[PDB]
């Protein structure tokens, strides 16, 4: 097929097609699963071994991976991959903080305190001070991560007209503006479904803004 209909290549008579001289060659580790019938999974779906894909369940998945549906080649391809969850930033850290059960860590470190090594006893103490601090306090560790960022009352970061009729203002306003701008841009970038390597950059810049 081509842009203009007169440049197209149509088959004159009955025959078979042979591909020669590819511009390049793409080598992928993948498992091929040809299909003669309507396929139950579309492109992008992640699939474990023993999953239904095409032909009403006659053909299944051998490996772990990601589904590339080829309509041209009439084959369901699976690129070998896992479902593995790996994150970045304060969201991941907030997760790991939320997951922590305090008493368990306290007791583990207590067992760690009986160890003969001086260093290990030391580190166990240092950690246990933090853990017990959070415990006795009633403050959740995940609060060390921010969701809602507080805003100082305006009068404490004034925008004021001086004698000359000119305005003078605090730097906290510029910092807050940086924060808000990068944040909003992140919300719009997420709403529009931008790639990773973009959202990543934005998130990084957001953290540096808060900092």
């Amino acid at each position: 097929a081509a842009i203009d209909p007169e440049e197209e290549v149509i088959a004159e008579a009955e025959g078979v097609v042979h591909l020669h001289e590819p511009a390049s060659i793409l080598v992928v580790k993948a498992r091929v699963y040809p299909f003669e019938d309507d396929v139950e999974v579309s492109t992008g779906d992640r699939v474990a071994p023993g999953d239904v894909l095409a032909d009403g369940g006659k053909v299944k998945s051998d490996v772990y991976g990601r589904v590339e549906v080829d309509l041209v080649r009439n084959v369901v391809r699976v690129v070998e991959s896992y479902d593995i969850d790996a994150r970045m930033g304060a969201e991941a850290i907030q997760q790991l903080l939320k997951e922590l059960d305090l008493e368990a860590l306290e007791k583990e470190l207590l067992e760690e305190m009986k160890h003969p090594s001086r260093a290990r006893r030391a580190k166990a103490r240092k950690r246990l001070e933090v853990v017990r601090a959070f415990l006795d306090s009633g403050n959740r560790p995940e609060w060390m991560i921010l969701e809602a960022v507080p805003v100082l009352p305006p009068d404490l970061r004034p925008m004021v007209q001086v004698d000359g009729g000119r305005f003078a203002t605090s730097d906290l306003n510029d910092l807050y503006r940086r924060l808000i701008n990068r944040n909003n841009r992140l919300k719009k970038l997420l709403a529009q479904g931008a790639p990773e390597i973009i959202i990543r950059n934005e998130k990084r810049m957001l953290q540096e803004a808060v900092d």
């Binding site: 060659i25 793409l26 790991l96």
Partner: protein, 210 residues
């Protein structure tokens, strides 16, 4: 603020927590049975972008083909690491090689037709059919295949062997097939009366491969 409190609770070094927060490296919440370099992925492991891409999105690579050089392998066909993909290209990995933007598409068109040939009875080997490469006959002396019709000659030479089609006006009156070992004595667009030699068969003669 050292020692880091967040870093303390989660047992993460300054460099590690920096890498995670500032987006240098991924950290794994639920490995979901992931495996890297033969070892299974333990929770809270640090992965580079290379490693996370290899694990999550799978491994792949593309190699260039210099213009006017045909691939030594077929589309869809399995490959082994080190196996040369082309005269100038060697694959670094194992898997399914795929064609990217083929420059030339060769179409083999199927043709089923009917054509006659006449041979001395002693030379012929009787067979119900002739597979490619199989001997059609064996001739002790040079023999001249003669035209059994009059007309203009359409000569088409295949990879080996050929076809002659005689036509009066616009309608073909004859089709002769010349197998291997027969040299055509006529050219395209020539006029032949009945009885004049179209070709010469010499020695052994056999079917073409195509």
């Amino acid at each position: 603020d050292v020692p880091s409190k967040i870093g303390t609770l989660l047992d993460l070094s300054a460099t590690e927590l920096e890498q995670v927060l500032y987006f240098s490296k991924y950290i794994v919440l639920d490995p979901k049975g992931a495996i890297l370099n033969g070892v299974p992925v333990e929770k809270r492991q640090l992965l580079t972008d290379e490693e996370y891409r290899e694990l999550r999105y799978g491994k792949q690579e593309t190699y260039p083909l210099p213009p006017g050089v045909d691939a030594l392998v077929k589309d869809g066909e399995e490959v082994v690491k080190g196996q040369e993909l082309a005269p100038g290209v060697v694959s670094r990995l194992d898997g399914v090689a795929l064609y990217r933007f083929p420059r030339r598409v060769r179409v083999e068109y199927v043709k089923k037709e009917r054509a006659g040939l006449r041979l001395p009875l002693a030379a012929w080997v009787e067979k119900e059919a002739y597979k490619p490469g199989e001997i059609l006959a064996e001739l002790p002396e040079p023999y001249l295949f003669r035209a059994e019709e009059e007309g203009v000659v359409e000569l088409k030479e295949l990879e080996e062997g050929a076809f002659l089609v005689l036509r009066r006006e616009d309608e073909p009156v004859a089709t002769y097939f010349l197998p291997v070992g027969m040299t055509p004595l006529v050219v395209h667009g020539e006029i032949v009366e009945k009885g004049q030699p179209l070709a010469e068969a010499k020695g052994l003669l056999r079917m073409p491969r195509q």
